[PDB]
Structure 1
């Protein structure tokens, strides 16, 4: 059904009323979200059906209709925008300067903003408007605050 590029809400009618479980990015005919949001299950877009194509639980990413299309990366210096799509609330751009997640396999960007769990999948953008990763998988620090990795897939 809806093929338009843009940011989408991922909803379910299983619980009470309608519940927002996450967010995703439609781009080049491919829907990109976080794995933990859909758990790989098929998605409905009105009258149409989106079938999963690629997925990885460790990366916490999943694509529908085609391979991962998002390839832009954070430059390590510039500020970024979290186009946050919170449950029951309008889309909001929140500019922030990312921190770092240091791992045994290398460093990753990290956005320190607090949002309900149904906000996972929200895209993180650069000065050109390019999606440099997805917000929604990270850690809770000593003060109860949330820090998310800038999770980006690999393009083929």
Structure 2
């Protein structure tokens, strides 16, 4: 199936069924984070999805086509994390992003903590566009987790 939406990424090389990550399907392309699949091919029922583009430093990978998600956080408004935790139902969480300040510029960051198998969950603006993926970040002083709003480049 190539239906638009958010998907769990599952494996069976370990015990039982394990969720290694999450991804979004849009315009026939599956978008997830590189560390989730390590570029491996994916199964979709009877079909197969092969990697098309990826970059380890960006920690992004796309399947069946080029990266399609190009919406960006405006730097002002609150966003929603559509978290897909392993073994739990998808649930939206609204939040005001922080900032990752690097030498190459600033990127939005969401301060929400979830199991690592939630990596790849989409982050949305109020219009419903995917502005980035959740699951690559840091651990701060208190011990909580802060993830960047990781977005690719279309075309």
Q: Say whether the fold is shared (TM-score over 0.5).
A: yes
* 1:58-94 C-alpha deviation (Å, 9 max, x unpaired): 0000000000000000000000000000000000000
Alignment correspondent of 1:131 = 130
Q: 1: CA distance between counterparts of 2:2 and 2:38?
A: 22
Work out the number of aligned pairs and report it. 155
1:37 lines up with 2:39 in the alignment = no
* 1:98-123 C-alpha deviation (Å, 9 max, x unpaired): 00000000000000000000000000
Question: Helix, strand or coil for the counterpart of 1:63?
Answer: strand
* 1:134-156 C-alpha deviation (Å, 9 max, x unpaired): 00000000111000000000000
Q: 2: CA distance between counterparts of 1:120 and 1:144?
A: 18
Give unmatched runs, 5+ long, in structure 1: none
Q: 2: CA distance between counterparts of 1:143 and 1:105?
A: 26
Question: Helix, strand or coil for the counterpart of 1:53?
Answer: strand
Question: Helix, strand or coil for the counterpart of 1:144?
Answer: coil
TM value normalised by structure 1: 0.99
Question: Helix, strand or coil for the counterpart of 2:19?
Answer: strand
Question: Helix, strand or coil for the counterpart of 1:118?
Answer: helix
TM value normalised by structure 2: 1.00
RMSD of equivalent CA atoms: 0.3
Q: 1: CA distance between counterparts of 2:119 and 2:143?
A: 17
